[PDB]
Design a protein around this ligand. Structure first.
Ligand SMILES: NC(=O)c1ccc[n+]([C@@H]2O[C@H](COP(=O)([O-])OP(=O)(O)OC[C@H]3O[C@@H](n4cnc5c(N)ncnc54)[C@H](OP(=O)(O)O)[C@@H]3O)[C@@H](O)[C@H]2O)c1
Ligand SMILES: CCc1nc(N)nc(N)c1OCCCOc1cccc(CCC(=O)O)c1
Length: 163
């Protein structure tokens, strides 16, 4: 089982200036609960985007997709393709693809689940933004109710499964 997990603004922004252009502790806790104990697969720019206290993501096997021989920053297992990241895989569990836009694009044809956090922040897409992947007719989805964060931002979760 291969799952994509991401947080996006309503406008579909996931990334800006090498990071995430909002702060949402409730999403981080959701991300922790779904990924803890599992393999997380990410592109190299997302690896470098991790704050130092979260690089590597503790309690998860961190696999980084790169075309380089290896990385200066420690704690990852490097692979040269998504296929190499995904096999062999943890039994009875999802392998989570955790971004960014380039690796979501590679992983979307292979995924059977998407877990999306939508953040009601007003972020018109800017020229160099990373955007969320668009899901096609092969996905069925359900949506949770709108929630309010302690910081006042409204957010909700969407869960998609491959038909
Ligand atoms: N909101 C969210 O949920 C979320 C989640 C994750 C990340 N983000 C944001 O997304 C942005 C980063 O995303 P991004 O799309 O720019 O980068 P990315 O997908 O994280 O990483 C791109 C890198 O992956 C490697 N790569 C890409 N395609 C490859 C292939 N076919 N084979 C081998 N390696 C390949 C390359 O590494 P090398 O250059 O090393 O060869 C490439 O530079 C940041 O702003 C980050 O904060 C947001
Ligand atoms: C939690 C964001 C997220 N949320 C969901 N739902 N899915 C994801 N794939 C996803 O990104 C995982 C990779 C980035 O991890 C972190 C982890 C901790 C703190 C930050 C701050 C970003 C900054 O300071 O710019 C980023």
């Amino acid at each position: 089982s291969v799952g994509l997990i991401w947080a996006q603004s309503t406008s579909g922004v996931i990334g800006r200036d090498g990071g995430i252009p909002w702060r949402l502790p409730e999403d981080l806790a959701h991300f922790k609960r779904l990924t803890m104990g599992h393999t997380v697969v990410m592109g190299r720019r997302t690896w470098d985007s991790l704050p130092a206290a979260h690089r590597p993501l503790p309690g998860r096997r961190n696999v980084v997709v790169t075309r380089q021989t290896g990385l200066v920053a420690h704690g990852a297992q490097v692979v040269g393709s998504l296929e190499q990241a995904l096999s062999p895989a943890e039994p009875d569990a999802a392998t989570w693809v955790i971004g960014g836009a380039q690796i979501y694009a590679l992983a979307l044809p292979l995924a059977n689940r998407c877990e999306v956090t939508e953040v009601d922040v007003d972020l018109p897409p800017e020229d160099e933004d990373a955007l969320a992947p668009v899901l096609d007719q092969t996905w069925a989805g359900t949506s949770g109710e709108w929630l309010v964060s302690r910081s006042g931002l409204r957010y909700r979760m969407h869960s998609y499964r491959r038909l």
